[PDB]
mmCIF file of C-alpha atoms in Angstrom:
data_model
loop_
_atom_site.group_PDB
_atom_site.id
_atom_site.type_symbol
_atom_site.label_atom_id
_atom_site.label_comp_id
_atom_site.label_asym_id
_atom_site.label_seq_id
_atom_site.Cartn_x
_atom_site.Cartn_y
_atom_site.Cartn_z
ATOM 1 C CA UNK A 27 -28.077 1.703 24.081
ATOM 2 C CA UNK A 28 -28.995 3.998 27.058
ATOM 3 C CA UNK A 29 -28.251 7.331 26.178
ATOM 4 C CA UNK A 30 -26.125 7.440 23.333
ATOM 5 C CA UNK A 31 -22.747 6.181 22.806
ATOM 6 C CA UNK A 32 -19.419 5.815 23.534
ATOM 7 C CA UNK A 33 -18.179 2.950 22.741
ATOM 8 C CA UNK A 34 -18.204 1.598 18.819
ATOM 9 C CA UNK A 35 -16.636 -1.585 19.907
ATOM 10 C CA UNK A 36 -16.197 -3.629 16.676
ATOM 11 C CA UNK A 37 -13.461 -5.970 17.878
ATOM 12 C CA UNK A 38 -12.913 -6.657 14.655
ATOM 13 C CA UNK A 39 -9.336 -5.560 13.835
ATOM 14 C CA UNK A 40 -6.927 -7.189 15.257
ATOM 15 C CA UNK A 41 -4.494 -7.057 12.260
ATOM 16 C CA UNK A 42 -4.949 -3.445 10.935
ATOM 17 C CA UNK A 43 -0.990 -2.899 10.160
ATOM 18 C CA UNK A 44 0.155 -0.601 8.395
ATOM 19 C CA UNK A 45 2.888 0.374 5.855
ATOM 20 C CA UNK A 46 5.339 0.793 8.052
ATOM 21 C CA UNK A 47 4.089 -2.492 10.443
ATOM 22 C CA UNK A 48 3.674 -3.991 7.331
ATOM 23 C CA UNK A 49 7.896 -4.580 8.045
ATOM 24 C CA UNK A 50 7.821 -5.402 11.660
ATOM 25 C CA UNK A 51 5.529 -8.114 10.856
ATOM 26 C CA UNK A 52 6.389 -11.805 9.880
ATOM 27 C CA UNK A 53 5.880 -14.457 7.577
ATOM 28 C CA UNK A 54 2.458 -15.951 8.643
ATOM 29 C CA UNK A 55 1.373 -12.481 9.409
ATOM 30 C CA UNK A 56 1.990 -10.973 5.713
ATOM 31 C CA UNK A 57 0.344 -13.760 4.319
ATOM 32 C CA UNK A 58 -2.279 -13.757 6.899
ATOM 33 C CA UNK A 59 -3.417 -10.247 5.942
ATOM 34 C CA UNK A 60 -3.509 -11.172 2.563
ATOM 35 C CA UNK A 61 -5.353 -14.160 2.718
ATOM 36 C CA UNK A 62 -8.177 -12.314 3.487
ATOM 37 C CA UNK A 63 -7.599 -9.512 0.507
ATOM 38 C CA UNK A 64 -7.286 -12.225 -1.777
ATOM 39 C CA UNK A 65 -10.282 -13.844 -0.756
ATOM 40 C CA UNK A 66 -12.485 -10.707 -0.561
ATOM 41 C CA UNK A 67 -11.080 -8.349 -3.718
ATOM 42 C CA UNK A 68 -10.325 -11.081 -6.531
ATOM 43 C CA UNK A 69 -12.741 -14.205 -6.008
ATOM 44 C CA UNK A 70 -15.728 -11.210 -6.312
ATOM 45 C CA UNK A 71 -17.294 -12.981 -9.699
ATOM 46 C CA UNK A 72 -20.795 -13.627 -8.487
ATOM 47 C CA UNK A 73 -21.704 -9.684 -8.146
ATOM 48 C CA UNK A 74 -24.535 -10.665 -10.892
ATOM 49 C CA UNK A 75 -25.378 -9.328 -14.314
ATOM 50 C CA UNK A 76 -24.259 -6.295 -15.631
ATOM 51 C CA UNK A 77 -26.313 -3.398 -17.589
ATOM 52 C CA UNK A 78 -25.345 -0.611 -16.086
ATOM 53 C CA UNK A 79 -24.154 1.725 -19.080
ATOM 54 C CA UNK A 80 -24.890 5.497 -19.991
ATOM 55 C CA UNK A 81 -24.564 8.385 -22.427
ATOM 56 C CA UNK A 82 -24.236 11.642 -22.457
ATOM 57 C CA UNK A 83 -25.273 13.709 -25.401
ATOM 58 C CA UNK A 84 -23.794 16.550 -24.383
ATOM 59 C CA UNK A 85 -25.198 20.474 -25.960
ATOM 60 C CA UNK A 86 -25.153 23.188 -24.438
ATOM 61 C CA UNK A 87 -27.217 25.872 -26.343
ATOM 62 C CA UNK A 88 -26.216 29.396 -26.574
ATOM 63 C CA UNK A 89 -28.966 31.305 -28.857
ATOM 64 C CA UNK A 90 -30.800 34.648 -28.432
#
């Protein structure tokens, strides 16, 4: 910015609760939280093909 920084403002968690939160919280909130897991974590099928697959031979000389 100026200098160099202080700041890291994300504003972007506003519903980081934790385990034990994860109790003091409500209905709407427990579902709230997971409607976004859900939606980013199981409906992740469009990633693309897939050909990513190696093998090790594996030998490890010992001669001389």
């Amino acid at each position: 910015g100026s200098s160099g920084s202080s700041g890291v403002t994300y504003d972007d968690v506003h519903m980081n609760f934790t385990e034990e939160e994860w109790d003091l919280l409500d209905s709407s909130q427990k579902r709230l939280y997971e409607e976004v897991m859900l939606e980013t974590y199981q409906n992740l099928t469009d990633i693309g093909y897939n050909w990513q697959d190696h093998h090790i031979e594996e030998s490890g000389p010992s001669s001389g």
